[PDB]
């Protein structure tokens, strides 16, 4: 599950890249006073991340993953409630599934021994073509 | 579907080889198989091979096996097919397409004319 | 190899008459843990590349239209053109993708009466 809804991160919370999920992975560049008049800078700040979103049909992406300054893994997403469709919430398609990036491994190192194939889905009349990391854990 | 784009048409003396290419936009070519496809004049479709790009997996027709070579290069987002010891029945149009875990060939590309001529 | 075999070669059919063609392997296509049957059908139109109308013998492609239906099972298979239109006029292709090598069948041609 994702602990919360995507907000605005603060640049330099974050270490390496913020990755978020429309089907297809993306990476979310920082924005600065004049792309956020409305979010309360402080002086200590210069670049932050919007990610809110509402879910890619009419939204960016279902949710995003990145990790904390102090090394941990953060991830955000959509509320919980065309499988994915409208109840995705990040990386994660089903219980047993996520959507394979290159640092996949790094933010989610429990998924090491997952079953990888190629799966495509259509979202708004955008193909994406992904790859999905799957299966058990006793 | 989604966006392969092959080279252009050419010419390649009885016995000498071809390296035609196929490039993916709007998608990274290694969430796809790439396969090849070749058609003679005015008859249908065989398989000739495909290539997981994510690892470089690749099966062939095994009647192709040796003639046929397909690469894959991810950092140009491009797939390829070398053809070597090409005869007059090699004349044919070449497409790549993609496919998901089913293999089934759900986008083409245009296609290249290859002409073994001396 | 699987032999794929369609029929008949060609069709002549006029706007809004329905049509059906036929496909048969040499194997049976059916992957049990799925219930699948490993079929797709092409649609190849003069002078253009193939373009995947059906696959998992009865599972339409999205975007295509509702007049094409893929039906059988084991090693007999259908496609059906409910309502046949002009633009139809086309090469039709089975294919197995099933097992190594895939193999394609001769194809049925589609021309049009007016």
């Known amino acids: 599950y994702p602990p919360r809804q995507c907000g605005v991160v603060s640049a330099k919370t974050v270490c390496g890249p913020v990755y978020c999920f429309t089907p297809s992975p993306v990476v979310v560049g920082t924005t600065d006073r004049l792309g956020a008049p409305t979010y309360t800078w402080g002086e200590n700040e210069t670049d932050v991340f919007l990610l809110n979103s509402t879910r890619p049909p009419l939204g960016s992406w279902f949710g995003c993953t990145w990790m904390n300054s102090s090394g941990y893994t953060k991830t955000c997403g959509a509320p919980p409630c065309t499988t994915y469709l409208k109840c995705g919430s990040g990386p994660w398609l089903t219980p047993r599934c996520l959507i394979d990036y290159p640092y996949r491994l790094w933010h989610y190192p429990c998924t090491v021994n997952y079953t990888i194939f190629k799966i495509r889905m259509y979202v708004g009349g955008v193909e994406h073509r992904l790859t999905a990391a799957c299966n058990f854990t006793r | 579907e989604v966006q392969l784009q092959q080279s252009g048409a050419e010419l390649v003396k009885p016995g000498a080889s071809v390296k035609l290419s196929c490039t993916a936009s709007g998608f990274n070519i290694k969430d796809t198989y790439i396969h090849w496809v070749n058609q003679r004049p005015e008859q249908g479709l065989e398989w000739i091979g495909r290539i997981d790009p994510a690892n470089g997996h690749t099966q062939y027709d095994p009647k192709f096996q040796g003639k046929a070579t397909i690469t894959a290069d991810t950092s140009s987002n491009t797939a390829y097919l070398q053809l070597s010891s090409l005869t007059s029945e090699d004349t044919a149009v070449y497409y790549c397409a993609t496919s998901d875990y089913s293999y089934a060939l759900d986008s083409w590309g245009q296609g290249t004319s290859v002409t073994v001529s001396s | 190899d699987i032999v794929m075999t369609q029929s008949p070669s060609s069709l002549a059919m006029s706007v809004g008459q329905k049509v059906t063609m036929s496909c048969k392997s040499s194997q049976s296509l059916l992957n049990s843990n799925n219930q699948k049957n490993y079929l797709a059908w092409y649609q190849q139109k003069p002078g253009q590349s193939p373009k995947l109308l059906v696959y998992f013998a009865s599972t339409r492609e999205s975007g295509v239209p509702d007049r094409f239906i893929g039906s059988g099972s084991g090693t007999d298979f259908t496609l059906t053109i409910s309502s046949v239109q002009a633009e139809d006029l086309a090469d039709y292709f089975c294919?197995?993708?099933?097992?190594?090598?895939?193999?394609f069948g001769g194809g049925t041609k589609l021309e049009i009466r007016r």
């Open positions: 294919q197995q993708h099933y097992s190594t090598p895939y193999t």
